[PDB]
Structure 1
Amino acid sequence: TWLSDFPQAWAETGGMGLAVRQAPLIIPLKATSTPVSIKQYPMSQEARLGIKPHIQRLLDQGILVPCQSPWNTPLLPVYRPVQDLREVNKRVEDIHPTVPNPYNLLSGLPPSHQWYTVLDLKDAFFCLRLHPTSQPLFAFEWRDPEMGISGQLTWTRLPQGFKNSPTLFDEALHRDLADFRIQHPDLILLQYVDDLLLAATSELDCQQGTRALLQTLGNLGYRASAKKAQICQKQVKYLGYLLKEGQR
């Protein structure tokens, strides 16, 4: 089965990812920026208890670490933690947006390629490391009033809610898949951040190309959702479109 054949490639079996070929990212600030420290709006016990197991898992995974930082932005409970990084985003230097819009991306799908595999990378941003010099930027406060600990945590990986994460991830995965494209010039590979479409001429070519892509992704440290994967189908859902007999 596709599951047991590629244990490293699936999030279900391969552990949390880590893009081992990608250097830890340095996040340049705008020329005039200084740190901003926003105090944490008090959180209800219900919200804190809802968020806590997620924080603990991220700590265990090394994705969060304790820190002391002159930067601080608030968490809101939505329960899962959502960080309001808008004041950090304002102080970080802009980069050119290189993620194509889905309409244009899909124009690169020729009618000769009607066998599809769609993969969704799990916890994609967390696969990219942050350089230690840039980690303090993203700090937030975490307290356990029944455990005594009251200090800051920050991210060791590219965080959710940071304005440049989608573009930085898209560019990093493009670098890591450049050789795959060269070794498989008969295949079409569309990348939209963490959403991938592979297109082939035939069921066999799609099967072989999908095996090659899963092997490559897992080897590089990325992880795809086995649950959501659409493997070697003539009909798939990709980026909100239904892809059927060349249409859409």
Structure 2
Amino acid sequence: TWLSDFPQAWAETGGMGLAVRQAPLIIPLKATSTPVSIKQYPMSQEARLGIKPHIQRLLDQGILVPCQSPWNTPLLPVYRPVQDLREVNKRVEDIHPTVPNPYNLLSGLPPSHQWYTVLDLKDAFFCLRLHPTSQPLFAFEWRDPEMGISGQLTWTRLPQGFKNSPTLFDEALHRDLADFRIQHPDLILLQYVDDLLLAATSELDCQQGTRALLQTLGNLGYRASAKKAQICQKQVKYLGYLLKEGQR
């Protein structure tokens, strides 16, 4: 089965990803920026208990670490933790947005390639490491009132809510898949951040290319959702479109 044949490639069986070929990312600040430290608005016990097991898992995974930082942004409860990074985003130097919009991206799908595989990378941003010099930028406060610990944590990986994460991830995965594209010139590979479409001319080619792509992704340290995957179908949902008989 696809699951048992590629244990490293699936998030369900391969563990949390880590893009081993990608250097830890340095996040340049605007020329005039200084740190901003926003105090954490009190969280209800209900919200704290809701967020707590997620924080603990991320700490166990090494994705969060303790720190002392002159930067601080608030966590809000939505329960899942959502960090308000807007004041950090304002102080980070802009980069050119290189992620294509879906309409333009799908123009690269010719009618000859009607066999599709769709893969969704799980926890994509967390696969990219942050350089230790840039980690303090993303710090937030974490309290366990019944454990005593009050102090800051920060991310060791590219965080959610950071304005440049989609572009930095798209660019990194493009670098990591450049050789795959060269080794498989008869395949069409569309990348939209963590959403991938592979297109082939035949079921057999789509099967062999999907085998090669899963093997490559897993080897590089990325992880796809086995639950959501659409493998070697003539009909798939990709980027909100239904792809069917060359349409949409």
Please state which band the TM-score falls in when normalised by the shorter chain. over 0.9
Superposed CA RMSD in Å reads 0.1
Separation of aligned partners in 2, 1:41 and 1:185: 53
Q: Secondary structure at the match of 1:3?
A: helix
Task: Give the C-alpha shift of residue 97 in structure 1.
Answer: 0.1
Separation of aligned partners in 2, 1:118 and 1:3: 15
Separation of aligned partners in 2, 1:76 and 1:145: 17
Separation of aligned partners in 1, 2:24 and 2:144: 30
Task: Give the C-alpha shift of residue 28 in structure 1.
Answer: 0.0
Structure 1 gap ranges (5+): none
Which deviations, in whole Å up to 9, do the C-alpha atoms of 1:52-80 show, x marking residues without a partner? 00000000000000000000000000000
Separation of aligned partners in 2, 1:124 and 1:201: 28
Superposed, which structure 2 residues align to 1:15-54 within 5 Å? 15-54=15-54
Separation of aligned partners in 2, 1:63 and 1:70: 20
Structure 2 gap ranges (5+): none
| TM-score with structure 2 setting the length | 1.00
> What residue number does 1:71 align with?
71
Identical columns (%): 100
> What residue number does 2:186 align with?
186
Separation of aligned partners in 1, 2:31 and 2:94: 11
Which deviations, in whole Å up to 9, do the C-alpha atoms of 1:122-161 show, x marking residues without a partner? 0000000000000000000000000000000000000000
Separation of aligned partners in 2, 1:77 and 1:159: 16
> What residue number does 2:152 align with?
152
Q: Secondary structure at the match of 2:162?
A: coil
> What residue number does 1:217 align with?
217
Separation of aligned partners in 2, 1:78 and 1:117: 33
Task: Give the C-alpha shift of residue 205 in structure 1.
Answer: 0.1
Separation of aligned partners in 1, 2:92 and 2:147: 34
Separation of aligned partners in 2, 1:205 and 1:242: 21
Which segments of structure 1 move beyond 4 Å, counting only runs of 4 or more?
none
Which deviations, in whole Å up to 9, do the C-alpha atoms of 1:167-188 show, x marking residues without a partner? 0000000000000000000000
Task: Give aligned pairs, total.
Answer: 248
Task: Give the C-alpha shift of residue 192 in structure 1.
Answer: 0.0
Separation of aligned partners in 1, 2:245 and 2:59: 46
Task: Give the C-alpha shift of residue 31 in structure 1.
Answer: 0.0
Task: Give the C-alpha shift of residue 231 in structure 1.
Answer: 0.0
Q: Secondary structure at the match of 2:91?
A: coil
Task: Give the C-alpha shift of residue 208 in structure 1.
Answer: 0.0
> What residue number does 2:228 align with?
228
